[PDB]
Amino acid sequence: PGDTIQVRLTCKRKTLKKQRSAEEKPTGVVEWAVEVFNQHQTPVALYSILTLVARQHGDF
Amino acid sequence: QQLASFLSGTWQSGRGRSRLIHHAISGEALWEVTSEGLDMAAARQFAIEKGAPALRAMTFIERAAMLKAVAKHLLSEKERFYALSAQTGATRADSWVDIEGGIGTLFTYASLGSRELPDDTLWPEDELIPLSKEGGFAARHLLTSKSGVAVHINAFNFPCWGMLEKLAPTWLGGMPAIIKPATATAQLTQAMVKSIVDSGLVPEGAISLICGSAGDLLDHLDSQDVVTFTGSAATGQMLRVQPNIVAKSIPFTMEADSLNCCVLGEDVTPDQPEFALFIREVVREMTTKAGQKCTAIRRIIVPQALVNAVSDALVARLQKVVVGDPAQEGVKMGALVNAEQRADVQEKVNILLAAGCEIRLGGQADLSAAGAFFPPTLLYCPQPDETPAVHATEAFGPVATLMPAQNQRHALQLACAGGGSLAGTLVTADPQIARQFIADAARTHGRIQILNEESAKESTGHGSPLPQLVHGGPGRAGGGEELGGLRAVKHYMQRTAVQGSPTMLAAISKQWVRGAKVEEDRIHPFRKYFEELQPGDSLLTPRRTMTEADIVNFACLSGDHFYAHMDKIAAAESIFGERVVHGYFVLSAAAGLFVDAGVGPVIANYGLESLRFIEPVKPGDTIQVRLTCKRKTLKKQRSAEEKPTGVVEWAVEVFNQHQTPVALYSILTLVARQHGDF
Amino acid sequence: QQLASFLSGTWQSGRGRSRLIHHAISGEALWEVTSEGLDMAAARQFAIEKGAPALRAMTFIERAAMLKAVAKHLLSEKERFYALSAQTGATRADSWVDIEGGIGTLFTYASLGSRELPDDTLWPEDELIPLSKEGGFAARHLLTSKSGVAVHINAFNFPCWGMLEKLAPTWLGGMPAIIKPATATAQLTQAMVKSIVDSGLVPEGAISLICGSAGDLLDHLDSQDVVTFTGSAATGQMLRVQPNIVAKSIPFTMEADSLNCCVLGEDVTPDQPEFALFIREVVREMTTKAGQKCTAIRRIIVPQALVNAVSDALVARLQKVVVGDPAQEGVKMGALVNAEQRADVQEKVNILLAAGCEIRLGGQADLSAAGAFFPPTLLYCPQPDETPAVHATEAFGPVATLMPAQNQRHALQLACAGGGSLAGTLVTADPQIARQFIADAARTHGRIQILNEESAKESTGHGSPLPQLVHGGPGRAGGGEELGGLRAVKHYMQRTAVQGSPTMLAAISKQWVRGAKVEEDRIHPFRKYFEELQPGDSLLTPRRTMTEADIVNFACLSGDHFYAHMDKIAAAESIFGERVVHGYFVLSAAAGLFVDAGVGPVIANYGLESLRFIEPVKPGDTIQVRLTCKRKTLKKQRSAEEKPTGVVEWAVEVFNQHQTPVALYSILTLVARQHGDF
């Protein structure tokens, strides 16, 4: 308690998917590396999330 | 045929040298006007001591309901008004403005008196003016209705509207009116006054009428009187130097003739829709009511490269205008009201032709016709800067001169060279050109319509002065102001700055103000009905200690993670010193303190008037709320199925343990009445 | 000695028949005034084409900062103003009022121009007036500053104040002034004008001065000019019928003589504290400035049983008033300004003696002394309603009649019988008597003080006209109003109702209008600084679905367990049909949607302008907020250490999935600036 929390989201890995059909939306599985820290700037609870992001232009 | 004059409660007519009213479209005389021998002193005396205390004894809500009742009673028998206005040479669409715009003015002033006026004889317009550090000396401005009469001297243009756009601020302001219509069309005015009087709605003495000259009315007016004028400048400037008006210092409001402009911008090219709506606006405004309205376009300002296109499109659109009898089909323009007005229009045209030019049928006007027909006239002035007769003389009909401009710098000067106008128009699609036009041309115009493609769909136009917009103009347009919403009812009142203690100002204003005495009577104020509430009925709520958990739960629930509430670091670097309670949570916990949970006369809330957060609320900082009644102002229960109610205002004063007023504000709240009226 | 006249940027003096200024307390002539041979057309031309566009190029915030700068520069060198005002025969307590009231008027108008006026050349006084169904045609009223001079013709009472209470609304209203002071005391006026001009604060042409008669000024005025008279009634009535004023129809505001009443109530008995403060108020107001102010009490209305008590107590208080030189000790009342003014006082005293009575030293006054002294005169009228000379003649000094009333019904008639007074006073403790007094006597008085024990602690009295209270009065007092706070700056402006589309009114007003176009530019509006916010910068927030759990959590957290939110039975029988979301939770979740969480230029909120909950929000009802910027209005950074900032107003439009507006309101916000100025 009283310990402030600041989060540093940053993009890590993009790795698009091939859009196996033509009806399916073009997308990619973008990985983000989350770096949470406090007022002393020490990294409490650093982790990494996967997250699906739609592409602008498809391929198939 | 006798055309009487409603004076001293009875319909009377004069006996002397009588003027007579000609029929406009045909030419025969079928009315006569005279007021010689009629006692004007007894008329003013009967008005002041019979209808002025009757109107002043009403509240503003009751006077607005009276205006609505007169509007409904005069809208019911509206067809005889068209039958009497067809004698003025106007068409059905031209008389539609004159009748229905005045009746809608009555409905609009009824709505304005019902929404923003109190349930009191008096009206406080301020909130509070603090004049002392301790708080025991303060002031506010009252508005008491004057104890005299309003002399309305109208023009021949709008009998119904022009009487009836002055009669609603006069009655709603609280004064009896004495209407002197112009003797060219007073039969429609007496039809209006008779439909008002033979309904039992208005008190006796609240309205009077003189069809003819006043004679001895202005020489008898007290200092509590006002005079409103509409007509020629030469008459009103001689009624401004009348010795009783300048001796007793009574307000003389004048609306003279103006040179209204319609400026075309440089951005408008003839392939755009702006050009066609420009031409349509000029043609409709010049042909509506045969050009006999005070807000009619009389100076068309175009660029130099667009002289031929405008001066051909106006001809191609105005040769379709058929000038004839209004009853026969296929007739757009009606006629003028008199042959004397036709001779006046033709001699003003002959003055304008001494230095101007000609594009169309101008000075050719048959003075021997059985009807006051004047053709639509488009003039031309090749040297507008070297011709003062264009910028000093109006031909009060279908006449409107055209003149070029030079790249939006000469156009503003030609729009301002009219000596002060009543109405104006810029037709552009560029907002910076409109900003530059209002920055210079609003000093001489009392109304400016910026017309473009988006505005031209649902616009009321240029010749219908709105009852909630200022119908005035400086200089040549008269100087006075009319129809300014609730600004027009302040010409019939006296503004008195009343000083004293706040507990005295609250009993004067019949509204609890800021620091008056309270009345706590052991039960909750939201449990009271409307009739048992009083301004000053207070409530001292229990306390609530603000904490860090309150800030956390409100920042979570609202979703407002602002840094002065949710950050320990940045709030220390801010002006507050530490993180504080949300102001909206102070508002919400205040409403949690004073609002009674049970079912009572309180229907809905729907309102919050003026919220100001003065000092910040911290954790460990208690909160106590002082709910007190402020303003009652019942509603008239427009139907019989609807519940009787009133919009009760509560001034809410929150404070901490140091008793300093954090978050003082004011809410509106609908409270149901016990007993109805309609 | 030449008392010059600041005309056309230079200090010029006249050549002709010259009046001269006497030293009031001793008798010698140490000035002489003339303005013959001075070109008034060139002075008006220099003002209109030099100082009028320099004022019209400034914003209202810049002109209020100019007022504050002139106020500080004139408060610094204020002791020479006391030295020049000691020549007027006034004491230190009278010259203190005369100087500090004008300088505090400048500070008050600087504060009112810095708080409620925009950072713009124009000022839109309305919010918006919708005039269509779809929302493409609306209007709002604009106030543009006039393009001419403001001829202020003052009186001999307050040179400093009476010049300087008209000059702050004139400069704040964007017009240059030409001051014609009275020739009895114009040396203090030229001291004021010289201290203004020799500072570099105001532009050249923004202020002028004429010592002596104007002669050819009123015959040259354009319709964009105003004339504000203050002085005798006959001179103002002769200037009202001046042919150029009635021909060009310029606004002529007059302030004339008045019979200011002071009514005593029936509840006041001599054992009460009301009697002592009544006698103290009458004596202090009658002896301040030796009765040479327009707000001085000249009639005292007492009850019939209290004639002897008041007529003894006033004499017992007034016999201790020493009439002498101000520089010698023990002297309370000073002297009049002229021996000619002493003769003009006594020739009215002799008219009041021709039908009244006498209590004290009346006409006993030496008309050949070495000083314009006049003893404090208390008259008496045993038949007040049968003597018209009491209610029509003012003796412009320490003279005030006394006259009885009958049970607060004759008292109202004697208060209203003055033909319209400038000010009035009721001294009661009963608030119903004050209510009945304001209900009848505020028709004739422009200002009424209700004085009791709570008011008299920090009251300004009766001879200190507040700069935010209306200094006027109908009828005999002139009819025109002054000092109405921001009502006084509107006399120096032209009110124009500008019509058009809301996207056009938004660029005309430089303020966002309800149906205008937006500027969404992909970054958050609270992240922008002040200099990169524009009126129209909008944010379309994401949606939040309201649910039953939202109603439950807000009713728990705030404590508002209202039956239309927390009861299934009672809300079914209400107007809503079922239990709805709290309005304050719609407000709170709206603020959770648009407020940026991070640290930025947004400092504090502290404000909410006008909250109206239109339609109810239910469970299962999405909510989307349209945060758009509306008004910018920077602050002048009063210290060099303080952060530069402005008060930015955001219009907030919340809506639902059907896109109908629920809970549209407006918030204020202090936003920090990127670049400072002071």
Numbering used by the authors:
A (entry chain C): 620 to 679
B (entry chain A), C (entry chain B): 2 to 679
Give verbatim lines from the article.
PaaZ is a fusion of N-terminal aldehyde dehydrogenase domain and C-terminal hydratase domain in a single polypeptide.
The map has an overall nominal resolution of 2.9 Å allowing the tracing of the complete polypeptide chain and assignment of residues after three-fold averaging. The model consists of residues 2-679 with the loop regions less well defined. Several densities that could correspond to water or ions are observed but have not been modeled. Three short helices (residues 449–459) from each monomer of the hydratase domain form two layers at this inner core. Another helix from each monomer lies perpendicular and wraps around these short helices, forming a tightknit unit. In fact, 3D classification of cryoEM data of both substrate-free and ligand bound PaaZ reveals that more than 85% of the particles classify into one single class ruling out any large domain movement.
